[PDB]
Amino acid sequence: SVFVGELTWKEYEARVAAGDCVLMLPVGALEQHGHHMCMNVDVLLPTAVCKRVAERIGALVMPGLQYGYKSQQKSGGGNHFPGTTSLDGATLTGTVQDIIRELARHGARRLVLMNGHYENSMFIVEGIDLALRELRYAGIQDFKVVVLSYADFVKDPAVIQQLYPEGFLGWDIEHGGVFETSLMLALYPDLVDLDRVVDHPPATFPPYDVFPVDPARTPAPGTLSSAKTASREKGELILEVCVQGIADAIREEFPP
Amino acid sequence: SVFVGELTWKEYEARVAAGDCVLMLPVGALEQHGHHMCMNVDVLLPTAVCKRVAERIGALVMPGLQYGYKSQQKSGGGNHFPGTTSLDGATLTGTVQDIIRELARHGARRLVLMNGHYENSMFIVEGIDLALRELRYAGIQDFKVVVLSYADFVKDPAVIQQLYPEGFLGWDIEHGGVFETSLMLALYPDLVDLDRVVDHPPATFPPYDVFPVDPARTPAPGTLSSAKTASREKGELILEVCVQGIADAIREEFPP
Amino acid sequence: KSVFVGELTWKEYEARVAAGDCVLMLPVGALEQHGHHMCMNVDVLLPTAVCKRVAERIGALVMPGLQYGYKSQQKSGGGNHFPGTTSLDGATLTGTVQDIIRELARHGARRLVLMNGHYENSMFIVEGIDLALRELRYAGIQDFKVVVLSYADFVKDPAVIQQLYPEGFLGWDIEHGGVFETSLMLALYPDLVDLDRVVDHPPATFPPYDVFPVDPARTPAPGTLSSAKTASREKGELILEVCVQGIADAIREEFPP
Amino acid sequence: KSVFVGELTWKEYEARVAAGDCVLMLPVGALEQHGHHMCMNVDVLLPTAVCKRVAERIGALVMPGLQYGYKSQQKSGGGNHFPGTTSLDGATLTGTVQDIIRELARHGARRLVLMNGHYENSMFIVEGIDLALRELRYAGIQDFKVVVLSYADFVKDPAVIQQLYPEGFLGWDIEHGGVFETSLMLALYPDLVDLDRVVDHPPATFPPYDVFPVDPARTPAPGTLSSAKTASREKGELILEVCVQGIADAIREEFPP
Amino acid sequence: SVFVGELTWKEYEARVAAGDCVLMLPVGALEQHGHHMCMNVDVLLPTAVCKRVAERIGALVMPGLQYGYKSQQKSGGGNHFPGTTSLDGATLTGTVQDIIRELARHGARRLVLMNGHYENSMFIVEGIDLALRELRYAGIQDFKVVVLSYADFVKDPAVIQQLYPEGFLGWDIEHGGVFETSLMLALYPDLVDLDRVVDHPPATFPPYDVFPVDPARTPAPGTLSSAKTASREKGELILEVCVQGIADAIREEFPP
Amino acid sequence: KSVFVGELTWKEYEARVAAGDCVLMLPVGALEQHGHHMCMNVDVLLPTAVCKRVAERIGALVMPGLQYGYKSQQKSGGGNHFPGTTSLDGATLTGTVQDIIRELARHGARRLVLMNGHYENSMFIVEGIDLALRELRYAGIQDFKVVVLSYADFVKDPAVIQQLYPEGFLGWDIEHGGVFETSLMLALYPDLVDLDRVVDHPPATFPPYDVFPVDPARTPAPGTLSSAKTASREKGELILEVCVQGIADAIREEFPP
Ligand SMILES: [Cl-]
Ligand SMILES: [Cl-]
Ligand SMILES: [Cl-]
Ligand SMILES: [Cl-]
Ligand SMILES: [Cl-]
Ligand SMILES: [Cl-]
Ligand SMILES: [Mn+2]
Ligand SMILES: [Mn+2]
Ligand SMILES: [Mn+2]
Ligand SMILES: [Mn+2]
Ligand SMILES: [Mn+2]
Ligand SMILES: [Mn+2]
Ligand SMILES: [Zn+2]
Ligand SMILES: [Zn+2]
Ligand SMILES: [Zn+2]
Ligand SMILES: [Zn+2]
Ligand SMILES: [Zn+2]
Ligand SMILES: [Zn+2]
Questions:
Q1: Which of A219, B5, E37, F14 has the fewest CB atoms within 10 Å of its CB?
Q2: How far is the CA of A40 from the centre of ligand 7 (A)?
Q3: F 64-83 residues with CB below 8 A of C?
Q4: D76 has binding-site annotation
Q5: Which of A76, A55, A48 is nearest to A185 (CA)?
Q6: CB A8 within 8 A of CB B36
Q7: Does residue E241 come out as left (phi exceeding 0), alpha (psi in the -120 to 50 range) or beta?
Q8: E253 is catalytic
Q9: Alpha-helical segments (H) within chain F
Q10: CB-based contact, E132 to chain B, within 8 Å
Q11: What are the EC numbers (chains A, B, E)?
């Protein structure tokens, strides 16, 4: 298995002892994803991508973080929806920091954090900085971290053309839209109910944000764009592009 | 499915709207469990118990906490072992506190916290107290929490007898011993290999603790007692006992 | 007299809030390197200048700006390894925002516009707001409203972008110390900008991931992510009018008399 | 003169530490209800009295005790809903333990015994130690050693249990305000114990789970978890000698000259 | 007894049930006090004063805080001295905050905080503000706190004359000097050896502070002024003056 | 050239630190009411002005000032119940100071002068410094030195005092929005002062203790603790010159070439 959790401590110790061990940490969230998809999408997707990449490059995958930072209206619909269960920033920051401290204790020095929930980004960044700060105080400066959001590897114009034959309207409205729904149809079809999709026009917002979050400014379903045209085939394409691109990036930063 | 993560937010909203919704949260850890068992045992076991209890009483199960508090020598072998990845107390406390705050926001009011890692206990308690303090400030006083360790439900002398026909040495040395291994043999056979079990005598300690933790005071394999006598049969018995007991406890504290 | 709260007596401020619909504006910046051609307080100067003009136009007041912001990030501000840049931890910034909101609510104020001028501050500003509003709710206050925005987001009109980038726009991701901020500085604080010192390097490009510890070799030596060679006072005057008008209208909309 | 650090001049204390193998002891207690028959500072008085005698016997010193501990839990101390009980949040207790260790390390001390007298303090004491040692490590100090113990854990000999509970021992989980602490108090602080006020109720029993908010009905009205009717100063004298001897030996073993 | 710690919870409950109960909290420190006195002086003195005041007005005294904030050169000699054991500001602030929260829970509403260590001042103030802020959230606005340093009640020129016939040189030098030593000689003579007093000239400093603290800027003995002219007689005067002055202040702020 | 770090490019700042003898100054103020006759940013303006003049004379640089300080206290600033006053919690201010020192150390700076203009900030500034130095020590840095001072403490000479308060001096404990500060302002920011609004009330007095919640009735209505009627530009100019000279010498003394 490539999952650290499924290994004995002796097996893990041996992999790290090899001195070239790469660890991967999926960071997700329990967040509403429309009327047509389950709420653990942000955990399922980065974990599935990590699994495949780890199998290609000989890396291991740590248990993913099940809860992420508060959903923001313009990216995830807003933290007023039921189901969505969010952590405070200090909590998420602290979790990332603690794990890095422990991995360094094990002797590990290479970590890939794969985020699947946009709002997690900066707290993940602070967790890394605080951890690296401590490691320096402890005389350690060779711990390297690569942070990435799997979707960012889908930029090829040709690929976008395939995924959005009618035209691409941007990633800003991709919450429970074509992209994630397609990936889910290719990985966890049983967790998708495409007939429940509400085909509303893409969400549009003014150049600012309002707090407390106003429910009226988010499409009723919770989605920011329609997944009506999502499909397994699209998911297949996305998965291949992401897996191959990420595998290459990791080989580049953590050369064998 | 009884798993909240697998439901759409609409489905979740409806279960909570019913007004009698009981939620269950498994709290585990990534911790060494000897030469013969995987490291995510503390998550897998309470999650499996929750699943079965939930199916019988009509409850829902939240994504489990994958990382818990620092392993202690007399209970989990010590936090010096490789693989074990632990959180600071404030981090675990904050995670529990944040989740409760959010569940209260959904309108949920009944929570069962099932601990699978002994060391988690007091930080789970502080997380609950801080959350309930906040809820009072918010005018909420009807949120009720039941906290339990699934193992505490195995007290029937007749059962202990069938489990330890050679005599019961206590629960203080069960880390990776007969109890957990038997459960794993019944639930996750592929994550256990009794052939690797190190049949050493039960671990014993003086009436005090020493820090920095001394590795010499913990059996080399990481286990506190031998799981040589573990069996699927024992696991099946343990499981049915815990499931039935916890289900009744919940029916008692959260009467329909 | 002045739109700045700091230049008012407590009696004057008190009277303005007594009006019942007084809008307060809070600039949130940073002390950060901005290439060889500009001073390091740009992120404070620009939003403060936009707030001043907007406040004057719609009758609002401006609170003292936050001089220090969150750690500079490589793909947005060059990186926190540069000297001069002086950054706060996330908890520190979040707490500052939270404290100020708590205090404004104590004054009786209920309308706040936070104008961020340093990209990296965004999420910590968001957390400060949420923690403050959470607290206000425990105190029985649910009518405090906050509008958060980055002034640059109001420059959307294609016709405006074409005038600013006649050779073609390449995205906002590489603007640190580039044409946009430099043009604004040329129009507002020409004394703090030396365009002759601009290093005309190609636009910074990055792979779809980030690396820590930050690698100095991945940021153009000058610290800028794009060349401000084509920056000008006229482009700055255009940006200012667009931002001021767009933001002033947004406030009238969200905070009507 | 005295074994208490607080009663020494800094010169005296300094001289003792200069010895190179000076052991320090820190009692960690609480202000908690202990039934109708005993005062509320029991958790401080007892470990402090045991520390005093142990310190005297082995040549160690005793630091001022922590007067406030973690929130009382129903199954161990009755619950934090009782009047009088004054508890600290976990972070507060953890931070106090951490600060003291940091300071002792600055004095040059490297041997500490933490004697807990309030069960609920346990894990927060543990975290204080870990955070302090983590910090000492960053400072290049890895020779600071800590021994943590609850004095009651040294009464293990069945022959002793038999004398204390001739009618049969029923576990330590119900001891709060029972035979054990009451006997020690009768031997150490007779003026602070009124055995005639004891409420002889049956041993408290609970299901295999905990409930929050704490339900007052699940704790005996007096606050005690078991009756101290059979307590006596003679039982207390026995307990004290067993603890003093056992702990003194443990310290000589872990902190030899 | 007037000490809360020596009462049973039933007795305490009864005194608070009266509705006019006044509580007193001594706040000291473990700090070096020259070659002639013990290090718990800042705990002993305020506690002694509280006892006598409490006896006269019918108040109760809470267990005192034994550890205070870091010693500052111009007030306590500096935190570079051995023996001195100080807490970080957040720790002291939180301790004060937690106690007030609990006293409020008991139903108490009148608190007198007697500081015996100058450096505690601002952290005590923050602890009080944070606690009162919290009480408001809970709906409590009738909790009142009086903060005072017993020394401030010795201002009468006549008394000053009697204490300093050779003229008073100010308070900013009264650390382990005449004032405190005189109180100790009268209250805890066994913890004072006047023959050890180092008769050095009053300490003086430039109009600024330096960090790291500079040892050479503090009189070698740790004292800021000689206590050679200290006496039991002076102590008795100080004591009675303070006890009386404070009792009157409390009667006024917490009118019977 | 400028003495303000904010107005310099990172290259100019880097060059000044590279010299190896660079001294930095950080003004720490507050947004606090100052009577009916002055603006609320006095505590930032004054220390900043003094820093500029001192910096110009000794060749030092001035960091952007902290605009928000600790909660106002009745006996010193009048109380935090006044509108306009916008205060931070202690941890927030402490962390701000701590973060800045950590960053300055990272730049290679090693000499810092913290000029406080708000009495209540004092102890939180001290804690920020201690936590930062503790941290630097873990990093292997022990050559970072900080000088903390309040410009008002350099005006003690009887010659000047007599000139400032010929009618008689009553101490500094009553100098909030009074003669000392108003005179400095009249000499530095006359437009932000209107002596015609000064409320000539008797010097404030309080019992030997504090009360919380703060009692408004114990603070003179205007918010001032002593009349500034006798304040003058002439007096301000005297103070300024005295402070600037004294501070410059103190710095020369602590941070010798
Ligand atoms: Cl997302
Ligand atoms: Cl376990
Ligand atoms: Cl920017
Ligand atoms: Cl106990
Ligand atoms: Cl003192
Ligand atoms: Cl002031
Ligand atoms: Mn998401
Ligand atoms: Mn475990
Ligand atoms: Mn920026
Ligand atoms: Mn207890
Ligand atoms: Mn003191
Ligand atoms: Mn002030
Ligand atoms: Zn998503
Ligand atoms: Zn286990
Ligand atoms: Zn910028
Ligand atoms: Zn007890
Ligand atoms: Zn003292
Ligand atoms: Zn002032």
A1: F14
A2: 9
A3: 64-68, 82-83
A4: yes
A5: A48
A6: yes
A7: alpha
A8: no
A9: 10-18, 42-58, 74-77, 90-107, 122-138, 158-164, 179-188, 233-254
A10: no
A11: 3.5.2.10
Phi-psi region of F145 (alpha: psi -120 to 50; beta: other; left: phi over 0): beta
The type of residue at E179 is F
Domains of chain E: 1-256 (3.40.50.10310)
Query: CA F59, CA F22: separation in Å to the nearest integer?
Result: 8
DSSP 3-state of C168: coil
Looking at residue E34, the DSSP 8-state letter turns out to be: T
Q: Which helix (DSSP H) or strand (DSSP E) does residue E244 occupy?
A: helix E232-253
Q: Which is the catalytic residue, given D32, D89, D153, D253?
A: D32
* Residue D112 β-bridge partners: D24, D146
Cα–Cα distance between E234 and A96 in angstroms, integer? Answer: 60
**Neighbouring-strand partners of residue C148:** A209, C114
- Residue E243 CA from chain centroid, whole number: 13
Residue bearing tokens 């209208």: C249
* Edge-to-edge strand ranges of the sheet holding F24-28: E209-211, F145-149, F111-116, F24-28, F61-62
Mind giving me the DSSP string for F1-21?
--SBGGGS-HHHHHHHHHTS-
CB pairs under 8 A between A and C: 98
Residue E82, helix vs strand vs coil: coil
CA dist A20 to A16, A254, F208, Å?
7, 8, 68
Helix (H) or strand (E) run with residue D100 in it: helix D90-107
Return the structure tokens found at B12. Answer: 């979740």
Could you give the 3-state DSSP secondary structure of residue B189? Answer: helix
Would you report the helix, strand and coil content of chain E in percent, each value rounded to 5?
50, 10, 40
Q: How far apart are CA A188 and CA F2, in angstroms?
A: 62
How far, in Å, CA of A150 to CA of A235, rounded? 13
- Distance of alpha carbon B67 from alpha carbon A92, whole angstroms: 12
Rounded to whole angstroms, how far apart are CA atoms F74 and F211?
Answer: 9
Alpha helices, H only, chain C: 10-17, 42-58, 74-77, 90-107, 122-138, 158-164, 179-188, 233-254
Active site residues of B: 31, 33, 42, 117, 119, 175, 180
What are the b/e assignments for A62-87, b being 16+ CB within 10 Å?
Answer: bbbbbbbbbbbbbbbbbbbbbbbbbb
Q: What six digits make up the tokens of C37?
A: 């051609």
> F1 Cβ partners below 8 Å, 6+ apart?
none
DSSP state of E33: -
Q: Residue B110: beta bridge partners? A: B144
Which residues face F145 on adjacent strands?
A: F111
Cα distance between residue A15 and residue A24, in whole Å: 14
Q: B23-27 and B110-115: which strand pairing? A: parallel
Q: Which amino acid is at C9?
A: T
Task: Check D14, D21, D36, D43 and give the catalytic one.
Answer: D43
Q: State the method.
A: X-ray
Instruction: Please give all residues whose CB falls under 5 A of ion ligand 6, grouped by chain where several chains appear.
Output: F 119
Q: Exposure of E80 by Cβ count < 10 A (0-12 exposed, 13-18 middle, 19+ buried)?
A: middle
DSSP E102-141: HHHHHT--EEEEEE-SGGGHHHHHHHHHHHHHHHHHHT--
